[PDB]
Amino acid sequence: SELDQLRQEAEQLKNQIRDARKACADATLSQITNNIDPVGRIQMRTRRTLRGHLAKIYAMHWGTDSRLLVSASQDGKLIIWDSYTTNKVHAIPLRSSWVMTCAYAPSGNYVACGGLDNICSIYNLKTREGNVRVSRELAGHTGYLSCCRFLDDNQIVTSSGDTTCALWDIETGQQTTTFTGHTGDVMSLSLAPDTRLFVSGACDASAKLWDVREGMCRQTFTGHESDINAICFFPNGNAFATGSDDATCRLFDLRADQELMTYSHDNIICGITSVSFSKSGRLLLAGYDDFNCNVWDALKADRAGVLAGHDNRVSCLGVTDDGMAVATGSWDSFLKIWNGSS
Amino acid sequence: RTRFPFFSDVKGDHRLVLAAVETTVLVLIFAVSLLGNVCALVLVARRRRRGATACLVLNLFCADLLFISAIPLVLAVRWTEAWLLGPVACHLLFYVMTLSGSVTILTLAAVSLERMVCIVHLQRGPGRRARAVLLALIWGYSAVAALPLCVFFRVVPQRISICTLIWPTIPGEISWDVSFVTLNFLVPGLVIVISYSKILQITKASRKRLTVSLAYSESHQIRVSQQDFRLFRTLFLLMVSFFIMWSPIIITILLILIQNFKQDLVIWPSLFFWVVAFTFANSALNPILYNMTLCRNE
Amino acid sequence: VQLVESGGGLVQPGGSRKLSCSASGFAFSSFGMHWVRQAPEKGLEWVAYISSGSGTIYYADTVKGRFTISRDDPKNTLFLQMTSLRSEDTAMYYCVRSIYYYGSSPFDFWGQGTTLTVSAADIVMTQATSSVPVTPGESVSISCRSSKSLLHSNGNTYLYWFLQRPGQSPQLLIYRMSNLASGVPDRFSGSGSGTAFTLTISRLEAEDVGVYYCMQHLEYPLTFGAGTKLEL
Amino acid sequence: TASIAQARKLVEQLKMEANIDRIKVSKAAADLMAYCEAHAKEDPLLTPVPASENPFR
Ligand SMILES: CC/C=C/C/C=C/C/C=C/C/C=C\C/C=C\C/C=C/CCC(=O)O
């Protein structure tokens, strides 16, 4: 017995970390937060409907300004919209129709798209010629690109279905770092607010904390019974929320190394597609497969509002940087801007 | 010169009971037709707002909503019996009712030619403006067609007054009536029957090619063809409901035509009111027929 | 980016002349194009504007009806045909770029210019000539005033600042009163409060000499300033 | 042969992961409580802003 001895050692180590996680669990968040006041019904009206795509929308990303948003649909078109005036600033024609992810640079100078083409293509919006052109096609991935997010204008972290995430230097076009450890297609990636750490959600039903500079996983979070389809970091960056196809969302803590609360209901049996917190981290919005989009209070797991405005699968969801609007994008080629009305 | 007391039964029996019955069957018809139309029109607007293939069914949904816009004056006159309303107010009723009727029958026959043109010819690949040009023509041809029922119409006293039709030229009157019957009830029924015979023969041909060209089994054909009656019943019901619902008004028109010469053929104005109520009820289930499979009573 | 122009010169009064603006180096089919003219020994003045795809066309009331403007985007050329040229239309005509989306900078690149020598209400902007004998290493503030509040309700303040070197075409310094144009040094700055605007230079060098113009952009009748000239 | 190298990489990865001094949940949730209750006056969805200052009006 050669492989059996150290594989045993491996399950002994994982049991050790399990009892360490269990030992540090002083109390559950639900009882700790049972003394706080409930948010109550949250009514959001669709202030703007961004019509214009002619195919299912697979991803949307707000610009740092909180006014421009990029949207990617399988019509082969990536459109930058002006949310305030429902106008289309640009409509980039994608080389491949199959787009599964879209990103907006923190500066706003660039946007990126990825998909079954297996390449993340960076587009330079600010050009002297006056047209948006592909600056760099990052092509070193074996599997489809699931989510791509920019740290700077030169560095972008991309998640793929080859079970690996990679940090890319746009100028050279080479992966500075490759993150390996997932045994299943990575479907989602969220960076820390400080952009020092990122959490990746995969079909192996595990989410791993990775550090961009060290190059490898720091922590692994388990507890989902099905593939994680969406992941989002809490505003502080000490927590993240994961949405899976078992119709449940879980809040994990990077310091307690374990989950804290689970957001599920017997009325919902459709898997999550995209999640995102509010500005203060009190509202965890989640887009579901049943055409709806619940608004979970991320402190008591009490469902506090539903955004029912779509007729197909809600695929993307994003709250602005100032937290003053929520944009949902579903498979009926319509984006919708929501905000609370007083 | 008894002409015809349109909606003016001078001597009713148990009018207290009779007038009450007419008013009730009429407000219920108004309620159901208006509710169904405001539900179906907003549903189809929401569907088309999502970029649904341009359609003509909303034209039917607004035409039959306009159809029930004249029944308030109808049951207002049903009590009074004598048409107290002024001639100009009286012209409007007979003119709009026969503008909606000839815009409903013609859109029902245009919806069924658009459907046998797509499910057969333009399978998936017709100008919205081309359909728009047909649509505006339908509303127009209908208004122009029933214009003779506004010009050759005038109230005349009897005993105490009735809003009958003057129609000075009897040969012209019969020519217009036959051209209205053969161009607003005959050829639309023919094209509807022809179109729904095609959407059937093509479906039966596809199923037979499935069962004789791909070498299916008899047990399998019955686990796939579980909708053949479901589709059949649906479209046969469409055709027969159209015919059996729009036939009474045409046969009443023809019998009051032959009254023009056969004055001996005493006919009941109450019968005319009843067939008019039936034609009003036609607008009550047009949303039901064209939104049947969408919602089977929830 | 390059905008070369052809046509224009000695025109007898009452005649006609067509001016061509050949655009090469950018997507000409997606740029709104304006024509601006500058009378000799005088400031600039707007002439005409044609939107992308010729959808919307405007003219200045001085030349409205007499001038016509058209673009040929397959060959990337903008045209201006003038009829019945009087003695007041003698000026150097500039063919400028302009693109209008959120965050865009209109009036990016100005044309070379062609001299026109014909022989034998609205918003007005006021700025004194103010020929300041400046020296390299001086902080100078250039102020121009508007007859109306330039600040629109959406938040923008449609004021544009232009710099024209002696013997060269104008360029964009600051657009919307606070946004620096891409290409100019950071030393330029601007501010305002709806009226009585100013442009501040902190590290004035020997290159920042010429005439400074300020322009409104709320309504299409457009008006420049008199022009502040900096020497020494 | 090749699997022993990745197994060794995994065991050192777990060894470096285990050497983390984790804080208690009570101290960890208290910081999250302070963050949620101290930034509620600025959040525009927990406490909506009046429409006078709302740019999505
Ligand atoms: C499809 C068309 C519309 C259907 C619904 C119509 C409702 C209103 C009924 C209008 C009937 C109009 C004319 C009928 C024919 C001619 C009247 C002439 C007969 C009276 C006797 C005489 O000629 O002296």
Most C-contacting residue of A80, A87, A92, A129 (CB-CB within 10 A), to test interface: A129
Question: What's the CATH fold of domain A3-340?
Answer: Methylamine Dehydrogenase; Chain H (2.130.10)
For residue C47, give Cα distances in angstroms to C38, C80, C81, C89, C94: 10, 10, 12, 10, 9
Residues of B within 8 A of A54 (CB-CB) are: 51
- Tell me the backbone φ, ψ of residue D7, rounded to 5 degrees: -65, -40
Look at residue A10 and give its three-state secondary structure.
helix
The rounded distance, in Å, linking the Cα atoms of B224 and A203 is: 36
Give the closest-approach CA distance of A262 to chain C in angstroms. Answer: 41
Q: Which two tokens stand for residue C195?
A: 């009226």
Give the closest-approach CA distance of C25 to chain A in angstroms. Answer: 6
Please judge whether D33 and A33 are an interchain contact, meaning their C-beta atoms are less than 8 angstroms apart: yes
> From the CB of residue A113, how many other CB atoms can be counted at a distance below 10 Å?
28
The closest alpha carbon to B192, from B82, B289, B281, B287, belongs to B289
For residue B6, give Cα distances in angstroms to B14, B18, B142: 20, 17, 22
Residues of B within 8 A of A334 (CB-CB) are: 50
Distance of CA B177 to the CA centre of its chain: 17
Query: Which residue range is the domain that position C188 belongs to?
Result: 125-226
With a CB cutoff of 8 Å and minimum separation 6, the contacts of C211 are C43, C163, C164, C227, C228, C229, C230
The rounded distance, in Å, linking the Cα atoms of B287 and B277 is: 17
Q: Tell me the residue type at C135.
A: T
User: Do the beta carbons of residue A181 and residue A167 sit within 8 Å?
Assistant: no
Residues of A within 8 A of D45 (CB-CB) are: 42, 278-280, 282-283, 319, 323-324, 326, 339-340
For residue D47, give Cα distances in angstroms to A246, A324, C98: 31, 11, 42
Cα–ligand 1 centroid distance for C83 (angstroms): 66
The rounded distance, in Å, linking the Cα atoms of C94 and C44 is: 10
The rounded distance, in Å, linking the Cα atoms of D25 and D20 is: 15
Chain A, window 258-317: residues with a beta carbon less than 8 angstroms from a chain B beta carbon? 311
Torsion of CA C42, C48, C50, C51, to 10 degrees: 70
Look at residue A23 and give its three-state secondary structure.
helix
> From the CB of residue C219, how many other CB atoms can be counted at a distance below 10 Å?
12
Cα–ligand 1 centroid distance for B177 (angstroms): 8
If you ran DSSP here, which 8-state letter would residue D44 be given?
Answer: T
The rounded distance, in Å, linking the Cα atoms of C86 and B246 is: 74
Q: Which two tokens stand for residue A282?
A: 């009190």
In this structure, the answer to whether residues C134 and C53 fall within a common structural domain is: no
Give the closest-approach CA distance of A54 to chain B in angstroms. Answer: 9
For residue A39, give Cα distances in angstroms to A283, A304, A317: 9, 7, 21
Best mutation site among B144, B253, B266, B282 for ligand 1 pocket (most ligand atoms within 8 Å of CB): B253
In this structure, the answer to whether residues C19 and C111 fall within a common structural domain is: yes
The rounded distance, in Å, linking the Cα atoms of C54 and C31 is: 10
Judging contact as 3 or more Cβ pairs under 8 Å, the answer for A and B is yes
The rounded distance, in Å, linking the Cα atoms of C208 and C188 is: 10
Residue of B nearest to A55 (CA): B51
Ligand 1 pocket residue status of B48, Cβ below 6 Å: no
Look at residue A194 and give its three-state secondary structure.
coil
Q: Which two tokens stand for residue A197?
A: 């750490």
Q: Which two tokens stand for residue C41?
A: 């020994």
Please judge whether A87 and C25 are an interchain contact, meaning their C-beta atoms are less than 8 angstroms apart: no
Distance of CA C51 to the CA centre of its chain: 16
Cα–ligand 1 centroid distance for B124 (angstroms): 43
The resolution of the experimental structure, rounded to one decimal in Å, is 3.1
Q: Answer left, alpha or beta for residue A45, where phi above 0 means left and psi between -120 and 50 means alpha.
A: beta
The rounded distance, in Å, linking the Cα atoms of A285 and B50 is: 24
In this structure, the answer to whether residues C111 and C133 fall within a common structural domain is: no
> From the CB of residue C100, how many other CB atoms can be counted at a distance below 10 Å?
12
Of C1, C30, C103, the CB nearest to A128: C1
- Tell me the backbone φ, ψ of residue A339, rounded to 5 degrees: -160, 160
Of D10, D35, D43, the CB nearest to A323: D43
The closest alpha carbon to C192, from C232, C137, C136, C148, belongs to C148
Rounded to 5°, angle at Cα C61 from C57 and C66: 75
Secondary structure (DSSP) of A284-321: EEEEESSS-EEEEETTTTEEEEE----SS-EEEEEE-T
Q: Tell me the residue type at D32.
A: L
The 3-state secondary structure of chain B reads CCCCCCCCCCCCCCHHHHHHHHHHHHHHHHHHHHHHHHHHHHHHHHHHHCCCCCCCHHHHHHHHHHHCCCHHHHHHHHHHCCCCCCHHHHHHHHHHHHHHHHHHHHHHHHHHHHHHHHCCCCCCCCCHHHHHHHHHHHHHHHHHHHCHHHHCECCEECCCEECCECCCCHHHHHHHHHHHHHHHHHHHHHHHHHHHHHHHHHHHHHHHHHHHHCCCCHHHHHHHCCCHHHHHHHHHHHHHHHHHHHHHHHHHHHHHHHHHHCCCCCCCHHHHHHHHHHHHHHHHHHHHHHCCCCCCCC
The rounded distance, in Å, linking the Cα atoms of D29 and A232 is: 18
Look at residue C56 and give its three-state secondary structure.
coil
User: Does A325 touch chain D if contact means CB atoms closer than 8 Å?
Assistant: yes
User: Does C101 touch chain A if contact means CB atoms closer than 8 Å?
Assistant: yes
Q: Tell me the residue type at C71.
A: R
Please report the sign of the dihedral spanned by the C-alpha atoms of residue B139, residue B143, residue B145, residue B149: positive
Of A87, A126, A130, the CB nearest to C27: A130
Best mutation site among B256, B260, B268, B278 for ligand 1 pocket (most ligand atoms within 8 Å of CB): B256
Look at residue A78 and give its three-state secondary structure.
strand
Q: Which two tokens stand for residue D43?
A: 């959040």
The rounded distance, in Å, linking the Cα atoms of A217 and A239 is: 16
Q: How many CB pairs under 8 A join A and B?
A: 6
Give the closest-approach CA distance of C134 to chain A in angstroms. Answer: 33
Distance of CA C46 to the CA centre of its chain: 7
The rounded distance, in Å, linking the Cα atoms of C209 and A266 is: 74
The closest alpha carbon to D29, from A262, A241, A238, belongs to A238
Q: What CATH number should be reported for the domain holding residue C205?
A: 2.60.40.10
Between helices B228-261 and B269-290, what is the axis angle to 10°? 160
Cα–ligand 1 centroid distance for A252 (angstroms): 77
Q: Which CATH number fits domain B15-290: 1.20.1070.10, 1.10.10.10, 3.40.50.10090, 2.40.10.10?
A: 1.20.1070.10
User: Do the beta carbons of residue B115 and residue B64 sit within 8 Å?
Assistant: no
User: Does C153 touch chain A if contact means CB atoms closer than 8 Å?
Assistant: no
Ligand 1 pocket residue status of B33, Cβ below 6 Å: no
With a CB cutoff of 8 Å and minimum separation 6, the contacts of B89 are B73
Q: Answer left, alpha or beta for residue C53, where phi above 0 means left and psi between -120 and 50 means alpha.
A: left
Q: Which two tokens stand for residue D10?
A: 């995994």
Best mutation site among B167, B176, B180, B252 for ligand 1 pocket (most ligand atoms within 8 Å of CB): B167
With a CB cutoff of 8 Å and minimum separation 6, the contacts of C99 are A130, C30, C31, C32, C105, C106, C108
Give the closest-approach CA distance of B30 to chain A in angstroms. Answer: 32
Q: How many domains does chain C have?
A: 2
Between helices B15-49 and B269-290, what is the axis angle to 10°? 20
- Tell me the backbone φ, ψ of residue A13, rounded to 5 degrees: -65, -40
Cα–ligand 1 centroid distance for B253 (angstroms): 5
For residue C151, give Cα distances in angstroms to A258, C45, C127: 53, 22, 18
The rounded distance, in Å, linking the Cα atoms of C3 and A261 is: 63
Rounded to 5°, angle at Cα C51 from C49 and C56: 90
For residue C219, give Cα distances in angstroms to A87, B177, C99: 20, 61, 16
The rounded distance, in Å, linking the Cα atoms of D27 and D46 is: 24
Look at residue C197 and give its three-state secondary structure.
strand
Experimentally, the structure was elucidated by: cryo-EM
Distance of CA C134 to the CA centre of its chain: 25
The closest alpha carbon to B114, from B40, B25, B177, B53, belongs to B53
Is residue A177 within a helix (H) or strand (E), and if so which, with residue range?
Answer: strand A174-180
In angstroms, what is the C-alpha Rg of chain B? 22
Give the closest-approach CA distance of B279 to chain A in angstroms. Answer: 36
The rounded distance, in Å, linking the Cα atoms of B9 and B13 is: 10
With a CB cutoff of 8 Å and minimum separation 6, the contacts of B19 are B12, B78, B79
The rounded distance, in Å, linking the Cα atoms of A99 and A118 is: 10
Ligand 1 pocket residue status of B70, Cβ below 6 Å: no
Q: Which residue has the tokens 């083409």?
A: A117
User: Do the beta carbons of residue A222 and residue A247 sit within 8 Å?
Assistant: no
User: Does C25 touch chain A if contact means CB atoms closer than 8 Å?
Assistant: yes
Residues of D within 8 A of A323 (CB-CB) are: 43-45
Please judge whether C101 and A87 are an interchain contact, meaning their C-beta atoms are less than 8 angstroms apart: yes
Q: Residue C231 falls within a domain, yes or no?
A: no
Secondary structure (DSSP) of A97-158: S---EEEE-SSSSEEEEESTT--EEEEESS-TTSS-EEEEEE---SSPEEEEEESSSSEEEE
> From the CB of residue A291, how many other CB atoms can be counted at a distance below 10 Å?
17
Q: Residue C170 falls within a domain, yes or no?
A: yes
Give the closest-approach CA distance of A168 to chain B in angstroms. Answer: 39
The rounded distance, in Å, linking the Cα atoms of D18 and D8 is: 15
Ligand 1 pocket residue status of B279, Cβ below 6 Å: yes
Domain boundaries defined on chain A: 3-340
Is residue A19 within a helix (H) or strand (E), and if so which, with residue range?
Answer: helix A3-23
The closest-lying atom of ligand 1 relative to the alpha carbon of residue B100 is 3
Ligand 1 pocket residue status of B184, Cβ below 6 Å: yes
> From the CB of residue A200, how many other CB atoms can be counted at a distance below 10 Å?
27
Ligand 1 pocket residue status of B105, Cβ below 6 Å: yes
Q: Of C118, C144, C174, which marks where a domain is finished? A: C118
Q: Which two tokens stand for residue A261?
A: 């609360």
Ligand 1 pocket residue status of B253, Cβ below 6 Å: yes
Look at residue C230 and give its three-state secondary structure.
strand
Domain boundaries defined on chain D: 2-38
Residue of B nearest to A333 (CA): B50
Please judge whether A82 and C102 are an interchain contact, meaning their C-beta atoms are less than 8 angstroms apart: yes
Please judge whether A130 and C102 are an interchain contact, meaning their C-beta atoms are less than 8 angstroms apart: no
